[PDB]
Amino acid sequence: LISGLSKIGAERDIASRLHVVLPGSPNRGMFGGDGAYGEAKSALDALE
Amino acid sequence: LISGLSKIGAERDIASRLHVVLPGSPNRGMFGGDGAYGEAKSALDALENRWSAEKSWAERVSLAHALIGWTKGTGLMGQNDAIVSAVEEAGVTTYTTDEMAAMLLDLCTVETKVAAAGAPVKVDLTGGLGDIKIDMAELAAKARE
Amino acid sequence: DDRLAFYKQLYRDHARFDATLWVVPANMASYSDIDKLVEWVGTEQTESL
Amino acid sequence: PGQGIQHKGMGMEVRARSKAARKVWDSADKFTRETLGFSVLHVVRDNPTSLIASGVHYHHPDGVLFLTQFTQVAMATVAAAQVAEMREQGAFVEGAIACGHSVGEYTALACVSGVYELEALLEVVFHRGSKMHDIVPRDELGRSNYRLAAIRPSQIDLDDADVKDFVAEISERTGEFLEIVNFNLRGSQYAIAGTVAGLEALEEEIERRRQITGGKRSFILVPGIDVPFHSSVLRVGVADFRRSLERVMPRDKDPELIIGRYIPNLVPRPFTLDRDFIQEIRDLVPAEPLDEVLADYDTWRNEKPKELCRKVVIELLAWQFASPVRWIETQDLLFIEEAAGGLGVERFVEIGVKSAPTVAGLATNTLKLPEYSHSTVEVLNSERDAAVLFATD
Numbered sequence: 001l002i003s004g005l006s007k008i009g010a011e012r013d014i015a016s017r018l019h020v021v022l023p024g025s026p027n028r029g030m031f032g033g034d035g036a037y038g039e040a041k042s043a044l045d046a047l048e
Numbered sequence: 049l050i051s052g053l054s055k056i057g058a059e060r061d062i063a064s065r066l067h068v069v070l071p072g073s074p075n076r077g078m079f080g081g082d083g084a085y086g087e088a089k090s091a092l093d094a095l096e097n098r099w100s101a102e103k104s105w106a107e108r109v110s111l112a113h114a115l116i117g118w119t120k121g122t123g124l125m126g127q128n129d130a131i132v133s134a135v136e137e138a139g140v141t142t143y144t145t146d147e148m149a150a151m152l153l154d155l156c157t158v159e160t161k162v163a164a165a166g167a168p169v170k171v172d173l174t175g176g177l178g179d180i181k182i183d184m185a186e187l188a189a190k191a192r193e
Numbered sequence: 194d195d196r197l198a199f200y201k202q203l204y205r206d207h208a209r210f211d212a213t214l215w216v217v218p219a220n221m222a223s224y225s226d227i228d229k230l231v232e233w234v235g236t237e238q239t240e241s242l
Numbered sequence: 243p244g245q246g247i248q249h250k251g252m253g254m255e256v257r258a259r260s261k262a263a264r265k266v267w268d269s270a271d272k273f274t275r276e277t278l279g280f281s282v283l284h285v286v287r288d289n290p291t292s293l294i295a296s297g298v299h300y301h302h303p304d305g306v307l308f309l310t311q312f313t314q315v316a317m318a319t320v321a322a323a324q325v326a327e328m329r330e331q332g333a334f335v336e337g338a339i340a341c342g343h344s345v346g347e348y349t350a351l352a353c354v355s356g357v358y359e360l361e362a363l364l365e366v367v368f369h370r371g372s373k374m375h376d377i378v379p380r381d382e383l384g385r386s387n388y389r390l391a392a393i394r395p396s397q398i399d400l401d402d403a404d405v406k407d408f409v410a411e412i413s414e415r416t417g418e419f420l421e422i423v424n425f426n427l428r429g430s431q432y433a434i435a436g437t438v439a440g441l442e443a444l445e446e447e448i449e450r451r452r453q454i455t456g457g458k459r460s461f462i463l464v465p466g467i468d469v470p471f472h473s474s475v476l477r478v479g480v481a482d483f484r485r486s487l488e489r490v491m492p493r494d495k496d497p498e499l500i501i502g503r504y505i506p507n508l509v510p511r512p513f514t515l516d517r518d519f520i521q522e523i524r525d526l527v528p529a530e531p532l533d534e535v536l537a538d539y540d541t542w543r544n545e546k547p548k549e550l551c552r553k554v555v556i557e558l559l560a561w562q563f564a565s566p567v568r569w570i571e572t573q574d575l576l577f578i579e580e581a582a583g584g585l586g587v588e589r590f591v592e593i594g595v596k597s598a599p600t601v602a603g604l605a606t607n608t609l610k611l612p613e614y615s616h617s618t619v620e621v622l623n624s625e626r627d628a629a630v631l632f633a634t635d
Contacts, residue, residue, distance in 0.1 A: 032101060039094050046087050049227050056235035062294060063279025107279070237291050239303070
């Protein structure tokens with residue numbers, strides 16, 4: 001999705017920066033009870 | 049694969065702990081030039097959490113985490129071989145396959161086996177490539193180039 | 194057989210007493226292989242004639 | 243019943259239906275999984291080949307369920323679960339007299355008198371299995387110089403005294419070892435262990451004595467038993483097992499449920515705590531805790547009786563390892579007690595599912611030969627006769 005809007009921006013040639021707010025899960029590793037949020041969103045640091 | 053051998057162990061009822069050495073990549077985030085190893089193996093810390101979460105996995109499987117440092121093979125690294133000496137000039141250690149193999153067996157010793165039974169063991173087998181100030185944007189690319 | 198001959202060379206060198214080696218075709222990309230392999234690894238140790 | 247008739251998936255149908263059976267199995271299966279790292283359920287459900295346990299490695303080419311460390315555990319749990327269901331339906335009578343053959347005796351006490359926990363029962367029984375494997379000398383191939391053999395004194399004119407005689411003679415003559423191990427049926431079943439040559443020489447004798455034998459009649463050799471146990475050779479390893487019992491069998495237990503109801507093996511006559519009974523034990527089995535109690539019976543103060551029964555019970559179970567199991571006398575004793583207490587209708591029920599036909603068939607043939615008196619008797623089996631047990635029909 002990020003790549004897709006990157007193509008459009010590059011093809012139609014805009015220097016405008018699309019600001020993507022990455023819905024990170026709060027404070028990974030200090031909660032064991034969420035079961036979903038905590039683990040999945042820690043790779044957003046790898047995405048950065 | 050871990051789940052599979054966990055079933056066999058549970059079905060055929062063994063309390064024996066299978067020691068799985070997790071081939072972690074050395075020191076994620078301080079290298080930009082690997083392109084593969086560094087990013088993929090950082091979720092092994094999250095995998096250690098799955099074992100620390102799931103309760104009944106303890107008796108079947110123990111997680112031994114090993115970070116495999118710079119290790120020189122001929123085929124893939126045939127470009128990287130020449131600058132092995134260059135990287136080693138930073139006061140850091142690159143390993144032969146026999147050296148790293150020896151490091152992996154030492155985790156398989158009785159002393160470190162029992163340590164894994166009590167709690168997950170994360171081992172840094174890296175030669176100090178972690179505190180490395182060497183810029184990968186140059187000394188890696190140029191090496192490859 | 195070029196891969197098969199290598200493990201035979203590797204075994205006949207580094208093998209000690211009590212040592213038994215097992216070589217198999219395997220694909221870690223296949224879930225079927227994983228299930229079938231460990232189903233082979235975990236069953237009996239028996240040979241019926 | 244004892245070991246050897248155990249089958250794969252025995253009493254597993256009951257586990258799927260009865261709630262009492264599940265509690266017996268699961269409490270037992272959980273303990274075994276946590277402590278010893280294995281499940282009896284799996285072993286019974288599907289028969290494996292090799293198994294590695296905590297400190298031990300068991301391998302069999304056929305099945306582990308037929309290995310004694312397991313088999314005894316399986317048999318004990320199967321029966322204990324079946325009785326619990328019978329107790330839930332209330333079919334268990336308040337005055338029932340109970341007994342067991344070898345390993346079955348531990349289950350007997352477990353079911354009727356509740357002398358140990360479900361996990362406690364499978365401890366003793368498992369260890370008793372592991373104890374039976376290391377007792378006797380072996381070869382490189384695991385060979386034995388000894389074996390066991392099943393005698394039928396019938397088909398010819400021969401008596402129990404005639405069998406005992408002939409065995410005692412060839413025992414002294416050859417200088418080899420020949421022992422009557424089991425007295426099972428009056429004129430029908432007898433078991434004999436000792437030197438293989440002694441077993442062969444004894445086989446040879448009856449073939450000569452019986453005029454009609456062309457086929458080596460009346461003698462069946464036992465496959466799989468390499469130990470001359472229940473003979474004079476086994477008395478060494480009792481003290482360690484005698485302590486093991488006292489650990490798993492505490493002092494808070496029901497005296498009455500055992501007394502008069504329970505018939506030991508080493509002691510063919512019904513359990514009762516008396517100066518007479520304790521002496522009979524000592525005579526058959528000389529022992530330190532017993533000989534003192536006999537010396538001073540003036541300990542009469544009321545704190546003693548339960549404490550006395552608790553040690554006497556353990557003494558019988560610990561030395562059951564050594565002394566021959568008397569099934570003949572066990573059966574005949576029941577007749578003796580009834581006849582003196584009245585002969586009216588009796589029902590004989592065997593439990594443990596598929597093990598039930600055996601000692602019933604042992605009783606059936608026994609009900610025939612000495613018991614010809616024309617009595618109304620009912621032989622019932624948990625496996626076969628279940629419709630009659632629960633009375634549903």
